[PDB]
Design a protein around this ligand. Structure first.
Ligand code: MG
Ligand code: MG
Lengths: 224, 224
């Protein structure tokens, strides 16, 4: 019962985390340890009315990423959708979907990503997004719907992850408001990283226990 | 693009059939020539406002069956839902779901129905329903949620189909208003049969070209 998906909000220093069929709105305070729950833990179906009579409302979200504006892609196994999350408001809507990952992102056809994606996060470069499944990762442009480069092993693109738990996969992720920094999650552990679009660079440097640094999540994970 | 699902309507001699992501309402006039179309072909997402933003609105219904009153279960791959189709009106709604077949019908877990059901039809006996997948068939009770008997080959429970093309599978089916008669479909063919609960019987003779006997379906199937 750990974090399965997330995406950073348009509101500064804010992110949405998904656990089982629920979610929380956090002030994650990247340059601090005083992160706090702004909303939730709440059922996706209650907080997101537009998702209530859909599989996402029933089972939750297992992968996601923010695009731009108040929009983001959400996934649940084979299926995905593009929604307006309408932060600190009540007007969430579905824009595209629910449809299979293969119809939303054709280029994923025949790939390991077709039946589900483990995690993803918004890049700083153009409309680029990094996505992960197993020990593999993809780099796409969601605006033009293109695979920017070949699918590679995670370590090919993020070398600093070699030897760590993130080497073989990642349960969840989201991009920070601090430029070129992102957060990864797996088991009871998490990482904060500084990535470089198109380049191979390696930091940051303390795979940390999640609850020791995120106090706003005490009693929210594990959720079983 | 042939019929992939159907269910009997509470309204006399009326049945809904699903083709691709569309559907048609029909007076199928069992023992008469005035076999005609009442509504559609129309997109599911259009005819059913309650399904506009669901996977069913996107891909259609691949299997279903009426239960009691104005309700029916509809499926799409491993997912399903119980809806109130509100015959001849605007007021349709999702009653339960959508959830996985495994979660709506726990007894299907581990069986070949878990990830999808080909077709089904309501029995006249109690709250029982027959469902088909491949060359196997199931007999269940949807109120008490149980398999009434071990799943077995279609020919074992429906001997009259041995030899016929339905021996190995059914694209679709629905029960007739005339007692113990059901309609089965596969490709350009169909068959009207007389079944008897708790027994193994023939019959009704004549696997026929569907368009040959359903004047109202010309122009509708095959849907291309
Ligand atoms: Mg995940
Ligand atoms: Mg079917």
């Amino acid at each position: 019962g750990y974090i399965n998906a997330a995406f950073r909000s348009s509101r500064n220093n804010e992110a949405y985390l998904f656990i089982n069929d629920k979610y929380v709105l956090l002030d994650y305070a990247p340059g601090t340890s005083n992160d706090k729950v702004l909303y939730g833990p709440s059922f996706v179906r209650d907080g997101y009315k537009s998702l209530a009579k859909t599989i996402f409302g029933t089972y939750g979200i297992d992968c996601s990423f923010d695009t731009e504006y108040n929009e983001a892609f959400i996934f649940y196994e084979n299926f995905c959708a593009r929604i307006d999350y309408a932060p600190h408001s009540d007007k969430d809507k579905i824009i595209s979907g629910p449809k299979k990952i293969a119809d939303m992102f054709p280029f994923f056809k025949g790939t390991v990503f077709e039946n589900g994606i483990d995690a993803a996060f918004r890049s700083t470069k153009g409309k680029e997004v990094y996505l992960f499944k197993g020990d593999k990762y993809a780099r796409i442009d969601y605006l033009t719907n293109r695979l920017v480069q070949n699918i590679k092993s995670i370590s090919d693109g993020f070398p600093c992850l070699r030897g760590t738990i993130f080497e073989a996969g990642m349960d969840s992720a989201f991009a920070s408001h601090k430029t070129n920094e992102a957060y990864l999650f797996k088991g009871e552990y998490y990482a904060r990283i500084n990535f470089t679009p198109g380049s191979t660079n390696d930091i940051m440097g303390g795979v940390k226990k999640t609850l020791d640094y995120w106090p706003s999540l005490r009693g929210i994970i594990p959720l079983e």
